[PDB]
Amino acid sequence: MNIFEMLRIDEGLRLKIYKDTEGYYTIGIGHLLTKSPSLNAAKSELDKAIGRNCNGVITKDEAEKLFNQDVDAAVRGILRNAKLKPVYDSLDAVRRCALINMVFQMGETGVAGFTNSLRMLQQKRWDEAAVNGAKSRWYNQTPNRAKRVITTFRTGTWDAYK
Numbered sequence: 001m002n003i004f005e006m007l008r009i010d011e012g013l014r015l016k017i018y019k020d021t022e023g024y025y026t027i028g029i030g031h032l033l034t035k036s037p038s039l040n041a042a043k044s045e046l047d048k049a050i051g052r053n054c055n056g057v058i059t060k061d062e063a064e065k066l067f068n069q070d071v072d073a074a075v076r077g078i079l080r081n082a083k084l085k086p087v088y089d090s091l092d093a094v095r096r097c098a099l100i101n102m103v104f105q106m107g108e109t110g111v112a113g114f115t116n117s118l119r120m121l122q123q124k125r126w127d128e129a130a131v132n133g134a135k136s137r138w139y140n141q142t143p144n145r146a147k148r149v150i151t152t153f154r155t156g157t158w159d160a161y162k
């Protein structure tokens, strides 16, 4: 299993503009287009991201391109983030993936807010981190996804995904 396969399970793949769980316009494999209520704004954003007149629809190929860019962006974001980098550097391969997943989902800022959890991760206090990270809006809004990422952090294995 790898990051792409992981994220592909958690986000799905939709070729037509759709509303994510918070009601935001998205497309592909979890690619947020805009936080604005307007489908037009969404459609504009899409054309601009794709480089053509998509008319709210993209191809698999296009979805995968956006996905490749977003995953790269998440990794580079972590590596540039003063708060995130050390955590990332301290983790084993599987757990790194879990951190990449969260960042992809909620952005650097959002993840950087799990101060106490990050600290525990850094101290290799797996069980405590899992319990603390569960006390969050994130967990309460998308419990199933959250549980899968949390188990990955807790155990360092891909069990939650197999």
Ligand SMILES: Cc1ccc(C)cc1
Pocket (backbone or CB within 6 Å): 102, 111, 114, 117, 118, 121, 129, 130, 131, 133, 134, 149, 150, 153, 154
């Ligand atoms: C940021 C974060 C760290 C650890 C867990 C278990 C959940 C979230």
